[PDB]
Amino acid sequence: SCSDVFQYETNKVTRIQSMNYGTIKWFFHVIIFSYVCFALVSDKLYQRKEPVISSVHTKVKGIAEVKEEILVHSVFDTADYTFPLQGNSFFVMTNFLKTEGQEQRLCPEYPTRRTLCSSDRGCKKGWMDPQSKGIQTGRCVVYEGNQKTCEVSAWCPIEAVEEAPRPALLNSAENFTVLIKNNIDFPGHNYTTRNILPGLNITCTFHKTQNPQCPIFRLGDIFRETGDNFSDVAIQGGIMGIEIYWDCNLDRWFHHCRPKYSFRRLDDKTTNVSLYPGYNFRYAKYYKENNVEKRTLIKVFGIRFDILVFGTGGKFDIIQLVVYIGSTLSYFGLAAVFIDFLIDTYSSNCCRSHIYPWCKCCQPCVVNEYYYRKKCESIVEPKPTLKYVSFVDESHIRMVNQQLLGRSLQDVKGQEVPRPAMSPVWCQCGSCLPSQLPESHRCLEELCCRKKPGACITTSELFRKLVLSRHVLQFLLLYQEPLLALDVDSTNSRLRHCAYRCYATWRFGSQDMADFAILPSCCRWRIRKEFPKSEGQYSGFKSPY
Amino acid sequence: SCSDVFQYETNKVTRIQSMNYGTIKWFFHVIIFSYVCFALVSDKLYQRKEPVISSVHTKVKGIAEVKEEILVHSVFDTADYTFPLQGNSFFVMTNFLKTEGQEQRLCPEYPTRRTLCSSDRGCKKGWMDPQSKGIQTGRCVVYEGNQKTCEVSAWCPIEAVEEAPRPALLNSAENFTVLIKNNIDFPGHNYTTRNILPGLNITCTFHKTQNPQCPIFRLGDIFRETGDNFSDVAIQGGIMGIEIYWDCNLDRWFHHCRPKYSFRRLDDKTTNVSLYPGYNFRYAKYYKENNVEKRTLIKVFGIRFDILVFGTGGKFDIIQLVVYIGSTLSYFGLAAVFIDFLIDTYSSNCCRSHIYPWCKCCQPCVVNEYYYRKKCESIVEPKPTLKYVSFVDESHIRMVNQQLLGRSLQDVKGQEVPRPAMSPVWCQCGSCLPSQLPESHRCLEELCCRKKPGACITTSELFRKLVLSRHVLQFLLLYQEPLLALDVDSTNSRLRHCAYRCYATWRFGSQDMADFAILPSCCRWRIRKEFPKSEGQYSGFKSPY
Amino acid sequence: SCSDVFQYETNKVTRIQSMNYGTIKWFFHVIIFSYVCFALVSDKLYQRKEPVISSVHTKVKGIAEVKEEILVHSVFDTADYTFPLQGNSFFVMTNFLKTEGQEQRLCPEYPTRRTLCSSDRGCKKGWMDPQSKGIQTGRCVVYEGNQKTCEVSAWCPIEAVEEAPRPALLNSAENFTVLIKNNIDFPGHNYTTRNILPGLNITCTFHKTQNPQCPIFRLGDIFRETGDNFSDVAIQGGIMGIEIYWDCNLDRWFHHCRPKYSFRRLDDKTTNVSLYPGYNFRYAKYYKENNVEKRTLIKVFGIRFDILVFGTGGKFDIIQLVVYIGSTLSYFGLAAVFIDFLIDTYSSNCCRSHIYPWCKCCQPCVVNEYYYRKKCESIVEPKPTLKYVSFVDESHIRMVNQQLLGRSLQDVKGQEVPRPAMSPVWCQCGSCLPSQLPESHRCLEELCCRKKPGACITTSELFRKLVLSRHVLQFLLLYQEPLLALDVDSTNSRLRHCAYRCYATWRFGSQDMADFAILPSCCRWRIRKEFPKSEGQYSGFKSPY
Numbered sequence A, B, C: 001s002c003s004d005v006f007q008y009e010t011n012k013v014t015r016i017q018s019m020n021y022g023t024i025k026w027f028f029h030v031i032i033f034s035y036v037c038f039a040l041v042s043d044k045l046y047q048r049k050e051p052v053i054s055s056v057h058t059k060v061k062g063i064a065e066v067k068e069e070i071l072v073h074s075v076f077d078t079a080d081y082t083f084p085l086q087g088n089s090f091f092v093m094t095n096f097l098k099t100e101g102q103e104q105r106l107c108p109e110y111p112t113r114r115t116l117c118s119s120d121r122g123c124k125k126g127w128m129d130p131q132s133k134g135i136q137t138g139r140c141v142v143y144e145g146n147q148k149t150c151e152v153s154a155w156c157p158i159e160a161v162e163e164a165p166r167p168a169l170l171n172s173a174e175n176f177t178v179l180i181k182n183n184i185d186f187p188g189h190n191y192t193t194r195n196i197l198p199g200l201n202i203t204c205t206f207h208k209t210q211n212p213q214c215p216i217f218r219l220g221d222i223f224r225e226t227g228d229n230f231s232d233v234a235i236q237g238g239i240m241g242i243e244i245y246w247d248c249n250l251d252r253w254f255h256h257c258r259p260k261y262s263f264r265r266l267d268d269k270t271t272n273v274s275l276y277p278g279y280n281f282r283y284a285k286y287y288k289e290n291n292v293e294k295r296t297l298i299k300v301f302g303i304r305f306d307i308l309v310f311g312t313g314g315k316f317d318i319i320q321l322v323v324y325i326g327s328t329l330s331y332f333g334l335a336a337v338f339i340d341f342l343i344d345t346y347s348s349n350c351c352r353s354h355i356y357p358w359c360k361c362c363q364p365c366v367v368n369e370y371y372y373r374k375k376c377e378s379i380v381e382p383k384p385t386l387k388y389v390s391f392v393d394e395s396h397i398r399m400v401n402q403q404l405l406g407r408s409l410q411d412v413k414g415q416e417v418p419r420p421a422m423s424p425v426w427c428q429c430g431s432c433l434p435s436q437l438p439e440s441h442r443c444l445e446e447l448c449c450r451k452k453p454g455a456c457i458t459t460s461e462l463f464r465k466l467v468l469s470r471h472v473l474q475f476l477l478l479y480q481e482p483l484l485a486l487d488v489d490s491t492n493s494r495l496r497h498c499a500y501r502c503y504a505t506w507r508f509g510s511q512d513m514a515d516f517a518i519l520p521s522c523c524r525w526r527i528r529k530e531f532p533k534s535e536g537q538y539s540g541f542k543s544p545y
Ligand SMILES: CC(C)CCC[C@@H](C)[C@H]1CC[C@H]2[C@@H]3CC=C4C[C@@H](OC(=O)CCC(=O)O)CC[C@]4(C)[C@H]3CC[C@]12C
Pocket: A036, A037, A040, A046, A251, A252, A253, A254, A316, A321, A325
C-alpha cells in the first residue's frame, strides 16, 4: 500500500569508543582520499580526452655546391633536391649516381660473377634474374676486351655496380633549414591552435633549452640531437623522425596548448645489403634526342624526414568525474570490512587458548569478545526436526537437529549450545514414564531430566513455585486476558500449556529455544497430573514451523 | 569533541544458519569473481593502451616486358612504373594510353555524339563542356573526310576516346615483389620495435601459414588472397590495402609485439562510367621540339597500394586496475540484496494464504517470517496526533494517528496494530465519566475500555493488584529513588502517574505505544480517585514529542 | 567448520514510517536513475568505440583558359595543374611565375639592396646569403647599364624578385570540381562501408542543406562556405581542409553510418613575408638544348586540399555496460548516508537548545531523537581501568576510566554517563569503613554511597528486600541450578557474590556497567557482614577483561 511506500530503513549500529578503531578508520579514510585525489589530478580523470587532428606545412631553405668529377662546380637549390611535403614527409637528396643516355636496346650486362659468361650456354633466353634490370636474349657478348657478359634487352647502357660516392655530394645539406608549421584541431572540443604564435621570434633556430619553441630546424642539429653523423647517413641515406607532442589542457583557467619537439631515427641502421640499407630510389629523366626516346637514370640517395604529430586535448566533463567518483566510493568501506574482520577473529577462543600465551602482546585484543557479543546475534533454521534438550546434571543445552530413527531422545546427543546468561531404562531419575504417543512418535518423549543418575528436577522447590503454582499460572493467563472466565477443563488445559511454557522458559531461557524445547517425561507427567484433561489423549510437542 | 572523533560504527547483524542462503551467497560470489577476472584478463583492463605511431618504407622489385603495337618489345623497370612511397601509399602502373606530340593549338574535337556537328550553329564560342578538354571557338570543322566536329582550343591533337588496352601491357606486374619495413613506437610507454627482426629469413615470400612474418609480398598473391584477378584489375586499375595490425603487450613477462598482415580491396568494384571506375590519372611529359613547346600525354592506369597500420600497446597501470576493481566491488552486495528481498517477500502473509496452497513446493519458505522478525523492527513517526487505544473485548490495538474533530475517541477507529507478544452514550461498560477538560479537548478522554457491551476492566483483579496496589507503586517509586520522602499530595501525584504508566504498560506493552496510549475514563477516574490531587484540575495526556 | 561456511549475515534494520524520509529516498533514487540512464544513452557508454581506418581517392575535373603576356591564350587541363592525391592531400595550381632557359653559369645577381655593389669590396668569394640562390665569386658586375650587382655561381639567369601575378592566371579554378571517395573500416567490429552508396545522385554538387551527401565539391563553394575569397587565395596560395566526420552506430536495430562534411582553412592568414605566406614551391623543368643542360624554373602557387577523416564506430559491449553499472551502483546509497546524517545531527541537544528557539520551523525535527535512540547503541572499551560509580544523592553515573594514583575513588570524578531508563574523611554517610586491601589497592574501595552529607543507602528498605533478602538470593541461585546443595561457607560466598550483583544491577542497570561498577564501603561491608566468609580476606573487584 501507499503507506508502505513511504518508509525508510536504517541500519541498527553499535557505536564503539575505542582509540585503536577510530584511528584505523581515519587512517584508512585519509589514505584512500589522498590516493583518489592524486589519481584524479595526475591522469586528469575529470577530463574528456580528444586525439589531435593535424596539418603540417614545411619550407626547406638552402643551396649546396656540388663537386662531381667529369671536376665541375654546380649549385643545387630547392628545385634540385626537394619537393613539397607529401603525407607529413619531406625528402632531401644528399647523394646521387647518374647514368646518361640510356636507350631501349640490346646490350651486354655489366660484368659481375652472375653475368660473366664463357659461351652462350651460360645464358638462357627470357631469363629474369631478380638482380638484373634486363631480360636475357640467350647469347652472351663482350663488355670490354676480354670480359664476356650475357646479353640483355633493357635500357642500355646498363648501370654500373658502384657504391654511393664518398663523401656525399650534398654534404652541405646539414646547413639546410626547415620551417615547420603545424595546425591542430580538437573537433569535439571545438578548439584549434598552431605552433607559431604572434610575437614568436622568426630568426632563431631550435634548441632544446634556449629556443625550445622555434620551429626552424637545422638538419645537422637534428642528427646531432639524435647522436648520428649527418656525413655518414648522407652517403647511403636514411629516415629521421620529427615528433611534435601536444599535451593540451583546454580548461580556461589552466589553459596550456604548446608543442614539445623531439627527434628519433626511423630507419634501421642495418649493414646487410640483403635488407637494402639506407634510403634510395631510381628516378628517370626522359628526353628526346634525334627523335630517339632516351633516359637519364639517377640513383637518388637522401634522408626522408617524417613529421609525427600526436597528442590529446582535455576539457572538464561531468560524466567522467561522476563515473570516477562512483568507481572510488566503495573503497571507503574497506575500513569497516577490515575492522569487522578483526572483531570476528579476535572473538575466537583460539586467539586466547594458544595465541595470547605465546604472543602476550595481543592480549588486550580480548575486548573483541564483548564487541562481537554486542554486534552479532546467531539464529538457526527453525526446521521441523529442530529440538532442544537440557539436563539438570549438565551445564549446557543440546540442539538435536536430527530425526530420531526410533532412538530415545535421551540417547540421541546433539550439538552443544550454551544456555543464555542472566521406571524406563533411559531414566536416570526414577520418576519418568513411558510415552502414550504412537510407537512411531514414542521416542521423542523418551527423555529424562538428567544424563547421569541422581535426584529429579521435579523435587526442586522452584518446580512447585513456578511450574505448578496455580496462582502464578492464573496470573499469567489473566495478564493477557484480564476478564477471563473458562470452564474447569478449559482452564486446566490452559494451565497445562502455561506450565509447559514456564518450564521451557525457566530451563532454556530464550523463547527461540523454548519453542522447540522438549519436556522430560517426569516433568511432563507431573504437569499433566496437576492439570489433567477430562477426556482423550495428549498430542505433545508440535513445531511452530 | 575529540573522543567523539575516535569512534567506530559497526552494523548489527543477524547470522542465519541456512544451507539455502549460504549456498546462494557463495554461488553469487563465485560467479561474480569469475566474471570479474575473465573480463579483466580478456580485455586487459589492468593495462593502459597507447595507439601506434608508424613509419613505413617500401621497396618494389621487378621488370616487365611490354608489347605495344606501332609491334615493339620494351622493358619497364622501377624508374618506369613506380615512384617512392608517399603517405603510406605506393603506385604501380599496369596499363597506359599514350598521345604523342600535343601542341597548344586549334583542332577539331574527336568525333562523338556531342562533338559531331553539321554547321556552325551546333557549336558556341567559349563553351566549356564538362566532358571536353578544350574550349569551343564557335565554328565546327572536319576531323576526317565526311566527319564534322566542333573546333576547340586545347592541346592538340585531342585524345581519342578509347578503352584501356586488353590485356594490360604490364600484366607481368603480378610477379613484382614489395618489401615493407614498418617502424612503430609507443611514446608514452617509451617502446619502439620493427617488423624485421635479426635472423628473419630474407629470401622468403609471405604466406599466411608458412611464412606469416616474411615482409616480402608478391602482388598477385595479395590479389589471390583477396579473391581478385590481377589481370582484370590491371586493365582499368584499382586500390588495394595492406593491413598491419599490432596487438602488443609490453609487460616484460608476457611480452609480445609482432605484426599481423591482412589484405583488403579498397576501391569500389563499380562498373558505372559515371563514377569513374578503377584508378587512372593523366600525366604530361613536356618537351621542346623546334623551339615549339610540346606535350606527350599518358593516361596512366594502375593499382595503388595503401599500407594501413593500426594497433595498440598495453602496459600494466595501477590506476586503471584500481578503477576497475572499484567499479566491480559493488556487485558483491547483490547476494545480500536478493536474499533480503526473498526474506521480505516470503514474510508476507500473501505467500501463505494463496501461494502455498497452490504451489505446495514453496511451503518450507515460511521460515522467512522468523527471519524477518529477527531482522526488522518497525516504528512510526511520533507525531503529536499519534494515539493508541486498546479494548478489553478486542484482541488488537488501534493507532489513531488522526485529529479528533470533536469526535469521541471511542467512535474514531484507527489502524489495527497487533499487541506485542510475550453513564455516557459511548460507554459500553457503565463506569465511565464525562471529561472535565475544555470542550475542545473533551473528546480525547471520551473513551471506554471496550467496544461492545459487557463487564469493565476496572473490576479485574489484576487492576487492583497492579494499577492500584499502593505497595507496588511505592516500590516502583523507590527503585529509582531509594531514599525518597515526599509530602502527601506529592506522593499521591507520583503514585497517580505511576498508575497511569502501569496500566499503559500492562495493556500496550512496549513503551513506544504506552507513551502515546490513552487511558479509558473508567480506569482514568478510578486511578484519580485512589490517588487524588489536593487542588486543581488534571491536565491529562501530553505527547512527549 | 563446514556448517560455519553455510551462513548468511543480514543487517538488522529499523523501518521508519515517515513521509519526509520516504519522499527524500525516492526523490534521490529517481534523480540518480534518470541521470544514470541519460549519461548511458548520451555518451553511449554501453558501446565499445573503435577509431576509423580510412582510404581516400579523389578525381579533379576542369580546364582553365590562361592569359600570360608574351598576349597568348592557353588551355590548362588536369595534366597541367594537378597530380594524383598523395597522403590524403591533392594540389591545384592557381598561379605561376616562369623563368626560361637557366644554365649553370656565372651571372650578376638580380638587383636588390643586398646585391647592389659599387666595387669588388662589397662582395666576398664563397658567400652563401640565406636570401640568395647562388654563391658569390667575390667580384661584382653590371646587371643592366648603371646597375652594379654581385656575381654569383648559380642557375642563370637569376629569378627576378617579382610578386605573384594579380589576377591569378588560373582563377577559373574555382569552377573546378572534385569527387571524393572515402572507404572506411572498423577492423575490430569487422565493418566497412563507403561514402557513395548505390542510388546516390551522381550529377549533383554538395550543399549543406540541399545535397549534404553529394561527394562532388566545387572549390569556390568550399571557400565561400569557409568565408574566404578564392580570387585572393589563388594569388599567393593556401591550404584548405575538407573534414569527413564518421559518427557510426553499428547496432543493427539503430544502425547509421554516414559522413558529415565540413570545411576549415588550415593555413595561417599571415601577411608577414618572414613567415612565408601562402603556399608555393619551386619546380624545375629540365631539358637539353644543343647538348647544354638547361632548366625552366616555375614558381608554383596554388591551394593544397587536405582531406581529414576522423570518427568512431560503436557496437554494444557487455563488459563496458557491466563496468558502467558497477561504477554507478554506489550512488544509490547516498540517500541513506544523507538521511542518517540528518538523524545524527537533529538528535544533538544543540539543535534544540539554540536552533529551534530561533528557527521555529525546524522544531518538528525532534523525532530524530527517538529515531537515533532506536538506531544506535553506544558502548565503551572494557579496559581494565574502566569503572562506574553511582551516588544516591546524585542523578547520574560516573565513568572513571582513569587510574587512581593513590586518590580515593570518592574524590576522583569521571565522565558523566546517564543511568539507563526503565568514619573515614571521604564518607558523607557515616557507615563506611577503611579498606583491608593492600595500601596500593586501598583507594579503589574508598568510596561512599553519596557525594554530599545525608542518609545512607543501606538504610533504604529496598536494600534489605533485594540485596540482603536471603530468600531472594537463594531463589536466584536455584534458578540457574535447580538442585543446588552447598556447604555453609560456600553458600555464604555464593550469596555474597549474588548480593554484590543485585546491588550493581539495582543501581547501574545494564550488565555492561554493573560488571565494572564499584560498591560503596558501606554497602560492601553490610553485605560482607550478612554473608561472611569463614576464613581469609576478600579480593574485591576484578575486571572481567
Ligand atoms: C576526488 C574526489 C574525492 C573529489 C572531487 C573533486 C572535485 C570537486 C573537483 C575535481 C575536478 C574539479 C574541476 C576541474 C576543472 C574545472 C574547470 C574550471 O573551469 C575553467 O577553468 C574554465 C571555465 C570555463 O568553463 O569556461 C572550473 C572549476 C572546475 C569545474 C573544477 C571544480 C572542482 C572539481 C569538480
